Design a protein around this ligand. Sequence first.
Ligand SMILES: C[S@@+](CC[C@H](N)C(=O)[O-])C[C@H]1O[C@@H](n2cnc3c(N)ncnc32)[C@H](O)[C@@H]1O
Ligand SMILES: [K+]
Ligand SMILES: [K+]
Ligand SMILES: [Mg+2]
Ligand SMILES: [Mg+2]
Ligand SMILES: [Mg+2]
Ligand SMILES: [Mg+2]
Ligand SMILES: [Mg+2]
Ligand SMILES: [Mg+2]
Ligand SMILES: [Mg+2]
Ligand SMILES: [Mg+2]
Ligand SMILES: [Mg+2]
Ligand SMILES: [Mg+2]
Ligand SMILES: [Mg+2]
Ligand SMILES: [Mg+2]
Ligand SMILES: [Mg+2]
Ligand SMILES: [Mg+2]
Ligand SMILES: [Mg+2]
Ligand SMILES: [Mg+2]
Ligand SMILES: [Mg+2]
Ligand SMILES: [Mg+2]
Ligand SMILES: [Mg+2]
Ligand SMILES: [Mg+2]
Ligand SMILES: [Mg+2]
Ligand SMILES: [Mg+2]
Ligand SMILES: [Mg+2]
Ligand SMILES: [Mg+2]
Ligand SMILES: [Mg+2]
Ligand SMILES: [Mg+2]
Ligand SMILES: [Mg+2]
Ligand SMILES: [Mg+2]
Ligand SMILES: [Mg+2]
Ligand SMILES: [Mg+2]
Ligand SMILES: [Mg+2]
Ligand SMILES: [Mg+2]
Ligand SMILES: [Mg+2]
Ligand SMILES: [Mg+2]
Ligand SMILES: [Mg+2]
Ligand SMILES: [Mg+2]
Ligand SMILES: [Mg+2]
Ligand SMILES: [Mg+2]
Ligand SMILES: [Mg+2]
Ligand SMILES: [Mg+2]
Ligand SMILES: [Mg+2]
Ligand SMILES: [Mg+2]
Lengths: 106, 55, 336
Amino acid sequence: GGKSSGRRQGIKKMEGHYVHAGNIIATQRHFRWHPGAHVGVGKNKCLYALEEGIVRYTKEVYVPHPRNTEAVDLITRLPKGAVLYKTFVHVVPAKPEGTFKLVAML
Amino acid sequence: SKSKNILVRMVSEAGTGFCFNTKRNRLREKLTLLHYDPVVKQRVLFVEKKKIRSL
Amino acid sequence: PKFPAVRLALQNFDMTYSVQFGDLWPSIRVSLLSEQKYGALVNNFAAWDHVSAKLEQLSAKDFVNEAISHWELQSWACSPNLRCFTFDRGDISRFPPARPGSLGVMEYYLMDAASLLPVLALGLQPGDIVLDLCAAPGGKTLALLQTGCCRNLAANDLSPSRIARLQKILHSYVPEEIRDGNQVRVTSWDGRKWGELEGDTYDRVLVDVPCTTDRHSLHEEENNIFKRSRKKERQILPVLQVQLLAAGLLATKPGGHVVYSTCSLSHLQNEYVVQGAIELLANQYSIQVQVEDLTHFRRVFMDTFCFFSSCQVGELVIPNLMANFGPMYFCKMRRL
RNA sequence: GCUAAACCUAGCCCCAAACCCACUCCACCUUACUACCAGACAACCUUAGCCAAACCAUUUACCCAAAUAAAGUAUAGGCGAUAG
RNA sequence: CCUAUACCUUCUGCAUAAUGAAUUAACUAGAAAUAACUUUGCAAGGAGAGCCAAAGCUAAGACCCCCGAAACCAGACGAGCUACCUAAGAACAGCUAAAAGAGCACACCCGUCUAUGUAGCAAAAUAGUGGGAAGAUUUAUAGGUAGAGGCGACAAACCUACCGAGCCUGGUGAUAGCUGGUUGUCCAAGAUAGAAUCUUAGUUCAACUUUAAAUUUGCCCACAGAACCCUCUAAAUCCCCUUGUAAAUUUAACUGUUAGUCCAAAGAGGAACAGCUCUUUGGACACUAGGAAAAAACCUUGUAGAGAGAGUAAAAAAUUUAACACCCAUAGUAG
RNA sequence: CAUCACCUCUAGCAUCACCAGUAUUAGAGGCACCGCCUGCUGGCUCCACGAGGGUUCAGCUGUCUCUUACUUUUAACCAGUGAAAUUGACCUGCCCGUGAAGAGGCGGGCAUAACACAGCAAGACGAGAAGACCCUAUGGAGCUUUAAUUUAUUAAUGCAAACAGAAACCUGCAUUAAAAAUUUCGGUUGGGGCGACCUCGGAGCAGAACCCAACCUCCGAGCAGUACAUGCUAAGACUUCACCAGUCAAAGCGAACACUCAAUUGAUCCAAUAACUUGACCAACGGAACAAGUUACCCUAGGGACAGCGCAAUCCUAUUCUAGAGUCCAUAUCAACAAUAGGGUUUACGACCUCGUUGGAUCAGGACAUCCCGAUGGUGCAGCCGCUAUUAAAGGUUCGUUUGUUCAACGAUUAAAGUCCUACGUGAUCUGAGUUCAGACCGGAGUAAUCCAGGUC
Ligand SMILES: C[S@@+](CC[C@H](N)C(=O)[O-])C[C@H]1O[C@@H](n2cnc3c(N)ncnc32)[C@H](O)[C@@H]1O
Ligand SMILES: [K+]
Ligand SMILES: [K+]
Ligand SMILES: [Mg+2]
Ligand SMILES: [Mg+2]
Ligand SMILES: [Mg+2]
Ligand SMILES: [Mg+2]
Ligand SMILES: [Mg+2]
Ligand SMILES: [Mg+2]
Ligand SMILES: [Mg+2]
Ligand SMILES: [Mg+2]
Ligand SMILES: [Mg+2]
Ligand SMILES: [Mg+2]
Ligand SMILES: [Mg+2]
Ligand SMILES: [Mg+2]
Ligand SMILES: [Mg+2]
Ligand SMILES: [Mg+2]
Ligand SMILES: [Mg+2]
Ligand SMILES: [Mg+2]
Ligand SMILES: [Mg+2]
Ligand SMILES: [Mg+2]
Ligand SMILES: [Mg+2]
Ligand SMILES: [Mg+2]
Ligand SMILES: [Mg+2]
Ligand SMILES: [Mg+2]
Ligand SMILES: [Mg+2]
Ligand SMILES: [Mg+2]
Ligand SMILES: [Mg+2]
Ligand SMILES: [Mg+2]
Ligand SMILES: [Mg+2]
Ligand SMILES: [Mg+2]
Ligand SMILES: [Mg+2]
Ligand SMILES: [Mg+2]
Ligand SMILES: [Mg+2]
Ligand SMILES: [Mg+2]
Ligand SMILES: [Mg+2]
Ligand SMILES: [Mg+2]
Ligand SMILES: [Mg+2]
Ligand SMILES: [Mg+2]
Ligand SMILES: [Mg+2]
Ligand SMILES: [Mg+2]
Ligand SMILES: [Mg+2]
Ligand SMILES: [Mg+2]
Ligand SMILES: [Mg+2]
Ligand SMILES: [Mg+2]
């Protein structure tokens, strides 16, 4: 007899939402959504925005890191011509890094 | 629930008095680690002095 | 509390085992209530040569080496590369706690010397694939790895809690390089599935089915088989022993050997289970097996063990005051 | 139209002020209110508990001699309730 | 004639045959702090020493009930009833018997069975029938033992007609998460996520609800967007510019509510068609009226008054079932 | 219960009980004489005796078959006196239906001038009080103890103190024991017994944002390993629906060139320590510093409770199916696997054990699915008896012996000794048992108090 409750894990910021640096985008048990452009990943597969901007969800080609033996062993057994796709979440920056302002006339 | 590991205290050999607690196997000789000492802001040798508790 | 499980276990044994052993039961009962002698199994991966010298200083003697030279004197052999040190007959001396060596692994393991015989009776050979059912907590599992004759091993025990204890034992003793590969496979699944998952896969199969452990039952108060909640499991315990042994028998390839081991003195769980599996295979799967004679095996280890010579098929090692090893029952049956 | 219904005093409450009473005759600690015989008898010693702590077991406010203020502060306390 | 199922209280729901009330008159139940708000005074100061102050400070107004245990303790009062004891007394025919805890049998004591009685003659009696009746008997008088106790041929008996611990007074307006009650008028807003708990008869927090204030977005929602698995598969949900609309968030101050019930739908409980129990979505009910016969949960319909006007909404069960052939037939043969 | 008799245990002594006594005594107890038997304490027999509990011969009788007559009290009426429980208001009908499910009040029908008096006891879940039944309270009390907390008190000792050529008493402080004192019985699983359970993670489990199915079914966790910058700081967010707690994290300093792992954990106070830091199967896992059992002697405050719901499973009844029994032969009868209707009952989890109103007397009402009497088909119906089916509720349906989850068995009869329903039909008409009780034993349980649907009074 074991009693447990839901972990309240899922999407925190949907498509088109404006996020700031550090805002958590999604919390996952497993990599349902993969980090994209300007999106970091925490220890618990938590996705947080590394930049301030708009969250976008796209489908991108999944090319695993060569060191990951399990994922490399999967693509090597795929039929030739097959391509893996996975859902990536990106943050499109809204503001520039900075602007040049006149400070003196020397 | 046999106590395989014990909690020991490592005392810095730099004389600053900085010490930290680490977990080590009971059936093992006294540890001599190379840990960072904030007082001298560098890694210094540490020596086990007293066992705190049995984990 | 309430009714002690120790007394309930002793009451059940006293009625059953008095008839089976007759006048030997009082001698067995004292040994069962007394602490069993611990044998020292030297870790071959560690400084085995140095530890062997160290143990001899503690008056320990390698009975396995002595038994090796007795094969030619009396006139399948046995699993080689096993070194177990025990004290003299009637010596109550206990070994010191094990210590890690210079290689980072424990130098030796303390275990019942009667539990090595199923490994010895297995007759392990180099290049074989070994299946152990109920391998956890690793009393027999470690001995197989000490031999180094098993390229691939499958250690399966139903209880994950026991399995977790086995892995820690393997990590502390067996170097990670051997465990790194697929050589040692550790799973937590029902052994009855092994008769269908992998048939004829292994050449040597060791099946130590769960049973009422006389040594543990009379002393341990936790998870005793004789408590009221466990009565249903005890009633269906003989059924499990017949099914688990049959699965192990089907798992081996023809021409291979399967050793059935049980830590109890109950005839209903030592000889009847062996006969039940043989009949079960022929009736349902039409499989015929031959039980080998262990009398030659007994005569070599008579010096360091006490044996009961009224067994239909297997060999039973009974505890005694001078030789406290046991109780252990093992039967070697090969598949044809 | 019967039963009834209505009434305004008797006195009382809280303060202030000031420190109160008890021999007319007879009887009255023996069975009190009983005129009238050898006694030897003599007083002093922490309150507790309910209740609160949501049980309870340490603990839990009770004028101690100037209103106010210091101050519910320093302190005390299963460092809890609360006390101060 | 037509229409209309008393009131209060307690429960999801009371005409309920659940609780309380014969009726009348009188009496009988919301006491207060910090903070906040409101209205004056003065103002970087306020206040009739002390105290607060980064617009405060001072004063006022405005919020916190009633009855009821079994108990516990302290100090008194009780053995004129009763339990036992002490002192000194009394009583017991007749007969059979014998120097009797003998028999029969009056007085006397007790109370076995039955009946009467049941607010009675009686808070234990009456009539008859019974046990004992020279003894461990019965009984009058005075004295003793007192409640953390006494006394007891132990029945947890008796100790002044409620003794598993007397009664009285005091602590005491004991306490009760429990029961019951809670008194003028009118209007307004107003119901069902949970967590923890010696906890599920309670309370605290959140949610919901209310008031005041501040601010600007709130709801509805076009695309776009939200996972692979164990092979596949639902109604949908989240997000959400327009648009339709008028709310929402925040600040301040608190109280109250919570197993709700039934209906529709999808499910859950060892792979349980109904029923029981428990989740989820929605509705209704605990708010009105009309209609389904009467009717909390179905249907119609909600914003409140008067009318001896009008147009409508839902709204009335269908169904009655079994005739039937006419004629003829030799044979290779019992293949 | 006590009781002689027997038996056990304790005590070698005086000026208030024992006792003005001295082991042939006194006290504390067991058992219940005696007699027999026995061990080194136990079992039978037996005289009388008993308002004890059963059984029986004979007699006796209105106890009964089967009641009747009379008298007295009561009664009713006349005169005098004159209560009490009770009472929301009542202008207080019946039958079906409906309904917090048992209607005088609601719906549909029927009935209906108004009033006393005397009877009756079906209803008004009639009235009063007591009690049963569980349940609840961080409500009480009695009792018991190897519940927890204590030795103040008392006794016996020790050392100190004191005397002191030595000894005691007293006092202080320790140590045992006795006898008492205060306090409590954590929740979940119809109850009890036996066991399990309480926190965290995952699945069946809400198919697609999140959350959500308790109970239930099943498997886990209370670790370990690698590091030793597993250093220090700091934007923005997540959050197990509160809080507590928990989670992620850019940049920066400093170094190098936010460890793995589903869970793998515990607050405050307090204790230890120079500091750092550490400490609970506080597992009843938001945790009280430390407290059991029992009550049938119970108490208080409250709550709940024959009747009612049940198209799946199961059972019964009647049809359908037409396999099969019946020599042949489905259908004289009987009938398998099943199906369709009516009725009863069981049911969400310990794939454990057990346990939670009914007869009789009187009076009956009603149903028909008919036991008897009647009528009519079929028959493997010659006739008498039978079997089966349709129709029929006008009438009837006995008396006894044991025994009784109060029912069967047996005996003798009868045309038959019907099945049910009616709040066991019916206890303000009566009565027995049970629910079960205040006393008491026997058996079994418990250290005891006490308990047991067990046996009995
Ligand atoms: C008696 S112990 C023997 C241990 C080991 N064989 C030894 O001697 O060192 C048997 C173990 O088998 C495991 N077991 C029980 N049932 C099993 C099953 N059905 N299949 C596999 N293992 C089982 C239990 O966890 C138990 O610890
Ligand atoms: K209390
Ligand atoms: K008697
Ligand atoms: Mg209290
Ligand atoms: Mg209490
Ligand atoms: Mg009525
Ligand atoms: Mg009601
Ligand atoms: Mg009333
Ligand atoms: Mg007290
Ligand atoms: Mg109390
Ligand atoms: Mg007297
Ligand atoms: Mg006499
Ligand atoms: Mg007499
Ligand atoms: Mg007496
Ligand atoms: Mg008694
Ligand atoms: Mg009693
Ligand atoms: Mg009295
Ligand atoms: Mg009160
Ligand atoms: Mg409560
Ligand atoms: Mg309104
Ligand atoms: Mg109008
Ligand atoms: Mg023709
Ligand atoms: Mg007696
Ligand atoms: Mg008789
Ligand atoms: Mg007779
Ligand atoms: Mg007559
Ligand atoms: Mg009169
Ligand atoms: Mg009156
Ligand atoms: Mg009328
Ligand atoms: Mg009716
Ligand atoms: Mg009517
Ligand atoms: Mg009546
Ligand atoms: Mg009544
Ligand atoms: Mg409670
Ligand atoms: Mg008690
Ligand atoms: Mg939150
Ligand atoms: Mg708790
Ligand atoms: Mg808890
Ligand atoms: Mg929690
Ligand atoms: Mg009794
Ligand atoms: Mg007739
Ligand atoms: Mg008929
Ligand atoms: Mg009779
Ligand atoms: Mg009779
Ligand atoms: Mg009646």
